[PDB]
Protein: PSM Alpha1
Organism: Staphylococcus aureus
Amino acid sequence: MGIIAGIIKVIKSLIEQFTGK
């Protein structure tokens, strides 16, 4: 693995910047 193992570490930060709450 390489991207699938880190995708979870990024998907979390991605949803943060996205949401404008």
Notes: Helices lie at 7-18. The radius of gyration is 10 Å. The first helix runs from residue 7 to 18. The CA atoms of residues 1 and 16 lie 25 Å apart.
